């Protein structure tokens, strides 16, 4: 996350962190329930083997609320393509259930129509993660969150060098220096409604980070709600 703020205690409880064999975080995830984590399919090409960590806010020190979970099943979207970044979604079934507690809780899955009419219509959504805090910098040590404005689909399409498919949407700023960045991929984009947070996107990609005239690109969760439901039923 470039710009934005540190997630304060209890503020981003649905944040999951995928970690590699060397225990380093390489991508984000969103807790959907005790057994399922939502992440980006492209993250799965990033590590030989990986585990999921929940409840972590500072990778510099075990605080007590953290918990590592091994993955039992990786359900990647059949139609995902590394070439266009289309269908950038994957569901992880954990071997053991997550125990909810302070800093560990699921984000709600909305219904498609209501989500499209009322959530993606909101002024902003919230993205969060342990990724880079500058386009060329190193991974963040502290979990951060950033409020990102929903971006008109047409200006979004015009701003991008690559095709914005119907499975993607835009958020962020034209010139202001704030945006998700490398390491945040697979992480949560949620929208608040009457103090309840609903999952609306998955951190996907962008051209550099926080670049002038460019926005952050997110997988459009509302387009895979049936696919998610199926993935969690198995």
């Amino acid at each position: 996350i470039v710009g934005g703020q540190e997630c304060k205690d209890g503020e981003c409880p649905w944040q999951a962190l995928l970690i590699n064999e060397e225990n380093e975080g390489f991508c984000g995830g969103t807790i959907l329930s005790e057994f399922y984590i939502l992440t980006a399919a492209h993250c799965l090409y990033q590590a030989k083997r990986f585990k999921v960590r929940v409840g972590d806010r500072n990778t510099e020190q075990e605080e007590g609320g953290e918990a590592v979970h091994e993955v039992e099943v990786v359900i990647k979207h059949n139609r995902f393509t590394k070439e266009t970044y289309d269908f950038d979604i994957a569901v992880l079934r954990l071997k053991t259930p997550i125990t909810f507690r302070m800093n560990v809780a699921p984000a709600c899955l909305p219904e498609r129509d209501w989500a499209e009419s009322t959530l993606m219509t909101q002024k902003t959504g919230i993205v969060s993660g342990f990724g880079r805090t500058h386009e060329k910098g190193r991974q963040s040590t502290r979990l951060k969150m950033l409020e990102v404005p929903y971006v008109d689909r047409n200006s979004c399409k015009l701003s991008s060098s690559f095709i914005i498919t119907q499975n993607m949407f835009c958020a962020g700023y034209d010139t202001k220096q704030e945006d998700a960045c490398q390491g945040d991929s697979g992480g949560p984009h949620v929208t608040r409604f009457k103090d309840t947070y609903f999952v609306t996107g998955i951190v996907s990609w962008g051209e550099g980070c926080a670049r002038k005239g460019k926005y952050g690109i997110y997988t459009k969760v509302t387009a895979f709600l049936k696919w998610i439901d199926r993935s969690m039923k198995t």
């Binding site: 981003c12 699921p106 899955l109 219904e111 129509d113 209501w114 009419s117 009322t118 009457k194 103090d195």
Partner: protein
């Protein structure tokens, strides 16, 4: 209806028979007034944790 202040629903709003019908995410149950959503246990989805 649902375009007027989300139909007074706490969460999901659907316009059926020209009438507003409210509903809730998993882990919540529709209140007696048929509009509010009541968490069914601790750590309901979408709530920031206070303890």
């Amino acid at each position: 209806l649902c375009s007027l202040d989300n139909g007074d629903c706490d969460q999901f709003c659907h316009e059926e028979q020209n009438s507003v019908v409210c509903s809730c995410a998993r882990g919540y149950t529709l209140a007696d007034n048929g509009k509010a959503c009541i968490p069914t246990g601790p750590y309901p989805c979408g709530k920031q944790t206070l303890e």
